[PDB]
Amino acid sequence: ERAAKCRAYAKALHYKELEFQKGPTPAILESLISINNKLQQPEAAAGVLEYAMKHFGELEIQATWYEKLHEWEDALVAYDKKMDTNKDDPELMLGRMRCLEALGEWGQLHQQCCEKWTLVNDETQAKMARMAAAAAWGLGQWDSMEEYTCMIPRDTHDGAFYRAVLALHQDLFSLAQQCIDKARDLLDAELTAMAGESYSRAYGAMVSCHMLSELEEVIQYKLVPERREIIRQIWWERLQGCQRIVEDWQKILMVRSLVVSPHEDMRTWLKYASLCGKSGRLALAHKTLVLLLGVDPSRQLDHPLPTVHPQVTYAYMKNMWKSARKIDAFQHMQHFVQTMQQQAQHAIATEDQQHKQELHKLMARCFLKLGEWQLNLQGINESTIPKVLQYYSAATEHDRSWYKAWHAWAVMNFEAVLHYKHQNQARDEKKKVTEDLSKTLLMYTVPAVQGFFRSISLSRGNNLQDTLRVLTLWFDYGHWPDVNEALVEGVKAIQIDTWLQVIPQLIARIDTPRPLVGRLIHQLLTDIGRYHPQALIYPLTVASKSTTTARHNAANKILKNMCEHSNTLVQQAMMVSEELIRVAILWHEMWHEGLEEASRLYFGERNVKGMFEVLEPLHAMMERGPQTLKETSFNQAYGRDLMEAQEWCRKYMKSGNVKDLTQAWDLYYHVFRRISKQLPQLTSLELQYVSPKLLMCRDLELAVPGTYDPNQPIIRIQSIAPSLQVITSKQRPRKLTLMGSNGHEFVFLLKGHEDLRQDERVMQLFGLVNTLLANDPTSLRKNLSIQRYAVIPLSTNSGLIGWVPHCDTLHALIRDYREKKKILLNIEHRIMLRMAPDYDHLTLMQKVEVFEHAVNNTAGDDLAKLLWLKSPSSEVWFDRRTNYTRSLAVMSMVGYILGLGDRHPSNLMLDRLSGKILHIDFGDCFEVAMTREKFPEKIPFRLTRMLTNAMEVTGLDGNYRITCHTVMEVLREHKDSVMAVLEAFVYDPLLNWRLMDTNTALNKKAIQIINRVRDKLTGRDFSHDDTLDVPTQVELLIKQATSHENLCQCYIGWCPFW
Amino acid sequence: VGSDPVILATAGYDHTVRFWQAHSGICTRTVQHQDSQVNALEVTPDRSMIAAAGYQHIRMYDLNSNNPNPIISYDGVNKNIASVGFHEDGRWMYTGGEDCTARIWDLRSRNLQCQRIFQVNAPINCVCLHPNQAELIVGDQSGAIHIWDLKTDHNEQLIPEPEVSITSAHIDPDASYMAAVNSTGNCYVWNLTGGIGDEVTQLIPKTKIPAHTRYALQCRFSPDSTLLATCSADQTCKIWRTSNFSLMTELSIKSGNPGESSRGWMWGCAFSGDSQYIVTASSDNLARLWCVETGEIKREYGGHQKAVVCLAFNDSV
């Protein structure tokens, strides 16, 4: 019945939203925040209020708006302005108070209660009492409480509760006992009175039921003395565990205040004060701390701070920093630390060793702030570098373990290096120069390496950033002995696992020209061979068939080394990736593209030296003799012609005729016509014609491509399904499918002429991004992720791609809906050309009109509407939407940071079972797509109209935008991890080829690309000088993605109107 | 054609430039203009020939030889050429282009080359020449209005509100007022400090008219200097008094029901010599003749297959 109540809601919300579509009314708008609330969708509803504001300043008083927006701190100062300019107004005062009780402002709430007690109104007199009880409760003043309680009716949940508290102070336990049960039933029956349509009062019922059961433990804490530790444990544990915003915890602690004073609680309140800062209630956290100190809000500001409670001070000081006063904060830290080492070295008479160590750990966590703040106040320069390194090394000493400490020291050292490397690039723009630099860099490089190593070992599981950082210093430092020793030392020390994360990066430098670098890599890879062979074969196999000599050479040495312990795995994997390449582009398919390219160079460029270079491989390729039944049945129907077409071509090579060459082309065009006719008939491939060795395969030890990881039982290729569908396209990819040793099926896409290595590093970046979102509480709260897939490169040409199940391209879902509903597929298109035959040549102004014309004469639902018909129910429909909305905003932000262009309807798709969106085809990364010559993308990410429309109405205000800054928030915090990854494939040797494409050394370009990304992660992505905060930047971006002036300029294929 | 006392020319996405007879609505001759739409039409002060600024060319047909094809074409300039303007004394032609360049063309010579180039960052939407013939006002897509002194080559610039693009500027016969119209839908007016001959020629901000909610597409002063016309994307041409800066007459094609989605933008306008009438170009395939005082549609020029974006209107003796 419970999951049956939400169905009626979900369904009525559909029609309610479909109603809003026809005309936005405050009538609907009311019934909308309500139904989105019963459905316990807090944010989607918050969106409905955002719209309610920007369209109807009609429920009026900007103070009533801030109050409904739970921005109490804004509404208070808005009510003051509304009271000081107006009069007494019994209504304005009630709100002025509701703000104070939400803010935990008992001092002012009690003053405002008593100093204004004419209150001729009786309802004003009735409400008054509920609040002034809690205010009096916070201020101690129990006489004031009972006075105001004796005015609260005993028929209310509130009136029954406040008695239980007054009884507990006055030690009336049986009274308190009964008052709880009666307050429960007055709340249980109240949860049926407004059965659905209530505030955060359904979620605040948890707050009242939590407190009531807690107040029954405060009861347990009065006469019979046994559970003090057991109660304090559950109190403490169900607090680190519990996540309730500031306000509730105040009251929650106020119950615990009846028994345990702050001075005994200590840790309890510091954890609370800690949250008040992190959430953003510093004025409250301060007061919490002042109380624990038993000393001034430091009204004596010039004086030193009380060392009586070392932890509390540290708290105060870090609160002072996050507060305004932060040269003042830094200053109190230098001294505090100095007072702390004294209170250690001297005060410690051995018999105190726990105090000694916790005093040493607090100090470490002090130093780490000291260095952190020094860098913040001063930046990086010849003065601060050895000072912060001082602070960090000092923090490294006092905790020995602790990731942050070692990490920070490594980064500082690594940035000490960068500071000078970048300072010397500054000098050389305008002998003893390099000598000092050598001594300068070797000075900071070695400790950095060391630091990153002991940082990694303390990170097991999550150390991608630091692991990559080791590799920068490693690869980047053409090895001077000192560096290499530390590197060798680390590799010895650090676990082998670490390196799996980083295998494609290691392999990208097998053929390192530097002699000392190479050796370690090779040795490391071979050890990664001894354990975890599998995470190596595929990538090493690819490397071993490389045109670049030193690569495939060095690659083989490792494979040889791996046969000494895993031979047939190397052997199987060898052949399996060999046959898959054969299957990817067949012999005739290689000729078809090869006869096209050859006729361009000759019959349109007069190039025969290049034309011979197109054909000669295709001839030499076949010269090796047919090896499959498909290769032979080709060899009969076409072979002899081609063999003699080369005959004429080599008569021209020596004769230098033009009639010799015309016989060859006579033969060539003949076979072309034959193949071309057979190509739309290529819709399937049988394994027994195309590659027999694969049909041959049974029960291999080779793991199913990109399914190997430790922790998980190896799933191996048990059998390859005999048929591959040929996806009809310009590259005819294959739908290869394998059978697993578990029993499950694993479907793949065998692509033929696409360098999958970029897609790989992206999927890597995504992996990282996924971890980051799994670790931010809110992002984990909302299930925020990116559906990724497996990417197994097979060569520079080909590779495998994981087939995401249950998915259709955005383009597919439309084409079906459009044909079902008898709508011409490209109708917006045909509309545009009918209006403006030369659309592509118009001025921006002219284009916008034509574009707007098309939108105004087509339906913008489609996606929205087919997703409704798709759904088997409506809570499934609603969830699939909530899923879609989020997953998209996730990929909007991340895509932007990556610079992910080319997001047309065939490059993204929808999971038809979760709704979650999924990106494929990661060709155009970084501005690339925008930078291009023909039809530059102005857009940052696709936020097309039918996308916007499939979300909830109030879309971009609701779930989307919120999810945008949540995601973007995470990114800007962990910007270094994100930059480690991206830096690791921009400056990657083999992958720089996608930036010299600005034509249709590179060091300079690669630098920009990376700056561009940093800008995006430090809010400098728009204006050069303003450092824009998240919500602004996000707003700016959504604007940019929505602008008609941007979308009309998009290549027509991108379907800027879908 | 150009022999008639009135010249009225109309061009758009339908590959023709059609000439109309003002007083009737009959179309005299049509010319072929293929490969492009027409962005701006302007009849040379010499009444000899008309200029059709299009995509990467400015083809000029003849108003005398009453039949042939483009006398002159000007090529080798990439992206659209948006505004055309002439110098009274025969031989100068000014253009603004999407290629960020204001260009001066010598009409009495050869070369697809141009006598001068004025480079700005961001596309130029309009180019208009001060009556004194010595200064060119150039409004770009960034929202700057550059005044370029054709003598001193000294460039001076001015941004009003702009972060927003200025769509067209104009300056009245009597050189007392300058107008600029932007994509927000605002119309700026300035007072003209007549420097002229050892020139100061400075601008003093007078009013900002909230002309339109949608794009404002072109602004134009009446010969009179009495009125100011503001065409826009809200299917409207608004006519404002220069004494008052108040709305005098509104012309609109606003359909007649909220669920029509429009059909037609008010792309261009031109006043008659007496400033008694106004000609109107619209994306609904029709040029229109309006009576400025009543706002009565005194004629409708039907002929164009596709939309209209251009007008040229001429009264000279």
Ligand SMILES: Nc1ncnc2c1ncn2[C@@H]1O[C@H](COP(=O)(O)OP(=O)(O)O)[C@@H](O)[C@H]1O
């Ligand atoms: N990971 C995947 N899951 C499901 N289908 C895919 C996947 N990758 C590609 N496809 C299919 O292959 C088609 C073309 O592949 P795509 O990656 O867009 O390459 P290209 O842009 O070179 O055509 C898509 O329209 C889609 O149906």
Ligand SMILES: [Mg+2]
């Ligand atoms: Mg694609």
Ligand SMILES: [Mg+2]
């Ligand atoms: Mg692609």
